[PDB]
Design a protein around this nucleic acid. Structure first.
Ligand code: MG
Ligand code: MG
Ligand code: MG
Ligand code: MG
Ligand code: MG
Ligand code: MG
Ligand code: MG
Ligand code: MG
Ligand code: MG
Ligand code: MG
Ligand code: MG
Ligand code: MG
Ligand code: MG
Ligand code: MG
Ligand code: MG
Ligand code: MG
Ligand code: MG
Ligand code: MG
Ligand code: MG
Ligand code: MG
Ligand code: MG
Ligand code: MG
Ligand code: MG
Ligand code: ZN
Lengths: 60, 123, 86, 155
RNA sequence: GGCCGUAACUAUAACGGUCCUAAG
RNA sequence: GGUACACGAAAAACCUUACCUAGACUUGACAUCCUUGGCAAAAUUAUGGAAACAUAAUGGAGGUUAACCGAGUGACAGGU
RNA sequence: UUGUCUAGCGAGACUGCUAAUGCAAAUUGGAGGAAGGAAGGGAUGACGUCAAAUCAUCAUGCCCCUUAUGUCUAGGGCUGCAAACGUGCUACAAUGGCCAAUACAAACAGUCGCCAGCUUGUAAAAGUGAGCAAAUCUGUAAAGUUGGUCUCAGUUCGGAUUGAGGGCUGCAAUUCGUCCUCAUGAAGUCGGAAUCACUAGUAAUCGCGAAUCAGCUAUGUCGCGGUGAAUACGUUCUCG
RNA sequence: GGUGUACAUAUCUCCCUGUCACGGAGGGGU
RNA sequence: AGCUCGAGCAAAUGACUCUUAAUCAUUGGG
């Protein structure tokens, strides 16, 4: 069960606290970056592909 | 001393001697001290009957230390005679609140009764 | 714990059912799933069937059980005896 | 299997009595990284030494550390069963370090009141060759003298 | 000289534990 | 095992949730391909309701069907 | 308190000069220098081993279900409990407990938010209500200093557990949130055989911030600064 | 005492080791 | 009970593993 959960997440619930943030590219529920709306394992791929502007590897 | 059946230490200050009573804690003892105006930092042995009667009167106004134990006992019996899940959990000597009981919570289960764990001959 | 200005809580479907069954003389068990509802004074005298998770356990409220939560008088998991591992 | 000898940081002279050993024992009684607290402990103990012995605190401290300061060390070397010990002459720096470490360890165990008085009385007792660090030094010295035979073989 | 346990059909015990004696 | 055990999980009261009990559904909650019309979907208010869902309401942005709202329809969708 | 600070560019350190010895790479010492001989830290991780981990991020061969292993909802569960182990927090205390006054950071974050001030309340917080789309406004720094008190006790240590009254988030806090107040006051007085981390701003210790988040006994994770040690003789032994 | 006479063996827990045995620490049973 | 005296073996079902053995539980069987 993933397609139904994705569709239900897009659909608005009847309570405000019912709403949770899923990844927009994949459907992963846990470990989602609200700054980018993308889970960690897809954020890594996008950053390595250069899709997210300004996200360079950090050396500190 | 002179406060009911409790004998507070004579060589300790008043605001801790009051804590030595069962129904009186530390903050409430300070509250009684301030309300009665008696200055703390005064050793109980170096205290007089005028303060000893007023402190007793204010303590009597507050909840008696003797009746508190029977109040708690009555409340637990009340909670058990309802059939509440909280009462049942309190009955079988287990953590009443949402405390975990998997690997912890020995303060309510006493000493450990070690048993023989599973024999592992490999699989 | 629960706030004062908010007060108590009932789903109000249970409240409507309780009012109706109190006005009706020949009361029967009220099958409810709302374990979140607190036992209001008007609840007194009725009998409820609360969903423990599997079945509906019957609880008869009294003038004393007033205040607690309705599902608090029914359990959800059962444990009675371990078995020796070895 | 290191073939490198470690460097050594400066000891720093004490800014009151101009004696490096004072700074060393401050760092030894250091706990939780509290230089101020350690310095207060040391200077209060030295003032108590003033109040009691009526002599110079630095001289009393030197008389204590020189007397507690050991000569031989027994190094454990196991071959087949148990360990046979080996007496070796220690360098002066490690000698002083061991003296200070023993002084602090036996000072933080005495039955008395605040650690100020604890360490002060430990120092005044070690100034007269009667103390617990004295007993420790005596024990290691006697053990080395007993195991004097295996001194030739070290490794 | 005894007693007890022990091998992947059963059976037995190559083997292990222990008491006593001057030695079994 | 080292290289699992404050690890996946950078947040389990509902949701999450993939488990159990129960109430409901069947080209389906979601999508394409085809014959076909768009003069809807929402949201909210009533009654039944544990809520799913049912019977009635304002019948709705829009743009004439663009997206979507449908009927028919078998390939199929769907599976943590 | 006038040249901090912030961020673009650039200079600077190159065994560059010198002495020793070596054929030469090069090694050691000295000078000047902020920095000396990979100046400190990070990113950067070869062929391959363990048929190592992930079909539960995602994709996918093959098999299996197709009015059900697919879908919606309510309730329960993932939080159980004679036990065992791992990782952490808090302690067993005068280098301390409590109270009062008080000095000094960096980084980061913020318009369903950060919330200054004021009023109310023993307090969590409530109401009013400016300021800030931010080097401007907000997010109380604590250890530390001084003073008062306790005077070595299972205590003014230790906070578990337990009862009651309240606050906030949320449809909803019983299973199963956390905070405050009041009350109670388990064990524990340095921990057996045996083990872990660490070579300087490191260990130890004290606070601050952020991510996911309506809310969360995260004491977890990722970061920032304050104080700030001890030791390295050597490879005989121990693991790789 | 579960077995031979409180003891030993045996049993349980924790260390040890890749694992087991051996070994080490602790507990209980007439 | 299939065998030795409800117990232990035997048999089966699953867990376990690349698959077994062993192990772990469950279990019918008079
Ligand atoms: Mg999928
Ligand atoms: Mg959520
Ligand atoms: Mg909890
Ligand atoms: Mg334990
Ligand atoms: Mg759930
Ligand atoms: Mg229209
Ligand atoms: Mg048309
Ligand atoms: Mg490189
Ligand atoms: Mg494998
Ligand atoms: Mg692995
Ligand atoms: Mg699949
Ligand atoms: Mg549900
Ligand atoms: Mg879990
Ligand atoms: Mg003090
Ligand atoms: Mg300004
Ligand atoms: Mg303020
Ligand atoms: Mg002070
Ligand atoms: Mg005790
Ligand atoms: Mg305390
Ligand atoms: Mg609760
Ligand atoms: Mg003590
Ligand atoms: Mg190193
Ligand atoms: Mg498998
Ligand atoms: Zn993703």
């Amino acid at each position: 069960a993933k397609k139904s959960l994705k569709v239900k997440q897009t659909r608005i619930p009847k309570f405000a606290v019912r709403a949770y943030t899923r990844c927009q590219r994949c459907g992963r529920a846990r470990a989602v970056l609200s700054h980018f709306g993308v889970c960690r394992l897809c954020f890594r791929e996008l950053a390595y592909a250069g899709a997210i502007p300004g996200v360079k590897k950090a050396s500190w | 001393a002179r406060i009911l059946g409790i004998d507070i230490p004579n060589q300790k200050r008043i605001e801790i001697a009051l804590t030595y009573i069962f129904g009186i804690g530390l903050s409430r003892s300070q509250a009684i001290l301030k309300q009665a105006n008696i200055n703390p930092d005064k050793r109980v042995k170096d205290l007089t009957e005028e303060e000893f009667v007023a402190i007793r009167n204010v303590a009597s106004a507050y909840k008696i230390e003797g009746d508190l134990r029977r109040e708690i006992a009555l409340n637990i019996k009340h909670l058990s005679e309802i059939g509440a899940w909280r009462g049942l959990r309190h009955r079988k000597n287990l953590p009443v609140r949402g405390q975990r009981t998997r690997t912890n919570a020995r303060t309510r289960k006493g000493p450990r009764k070690t048993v023989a764990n599973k024999k592992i001959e490999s699989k | 714990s629960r706030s004062a200005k908010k007060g108590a809580f009932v789903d109000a479907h249970l409240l409507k059912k309780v009012i109706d069954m109190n006005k009706q003389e020949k009361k029967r068990p009220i099958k409810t799933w709302s374990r979140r509802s607190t036992i209001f004074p008007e609840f007194v005298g009725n009998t409820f069937a609360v969903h423990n998770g599997k079945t509906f356990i019957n609880v008869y409220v009294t003038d004393d059980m007033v205040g607690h939560k309705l599902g608090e008088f029914s359990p959800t998991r059962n444990f009675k005896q371990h078995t020796a591992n070895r | 299997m290191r073939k490198n000898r470690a460097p050594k940081r400066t000891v720093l002279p004490d800014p009151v009595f101009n004696n490096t050993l004072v700074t060393r024992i401050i760092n030894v009684i250091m706990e939780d990284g509290k230089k101020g607290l350690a310095q207060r402990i040391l200077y209060g103990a030295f003032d108590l030494i003033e109040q009691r012995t009526k002599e110079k605190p630095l001289t009393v401290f030197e008389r204590a550390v020189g007397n507690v300061m050991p000569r031989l060390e027994l190094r454990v070397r196991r071959i087949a069963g148990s360990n046979y010990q080996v007496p070796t002459e220690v360098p002066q720096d490690r000698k002083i370090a061991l003296a200070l470490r023993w002084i602090a360890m036996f000072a933080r165990k005495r039955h008395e009141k605040t650690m100020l008085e604890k360490i002060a009385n430990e120092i005044i007792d070690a100034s007269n060759n009667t103390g617990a660090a004295i007993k420790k030094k005596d024990d290691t010295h006697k053990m080395a003298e007993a195991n004097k035979a295996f001194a030739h073989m070290r490794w």
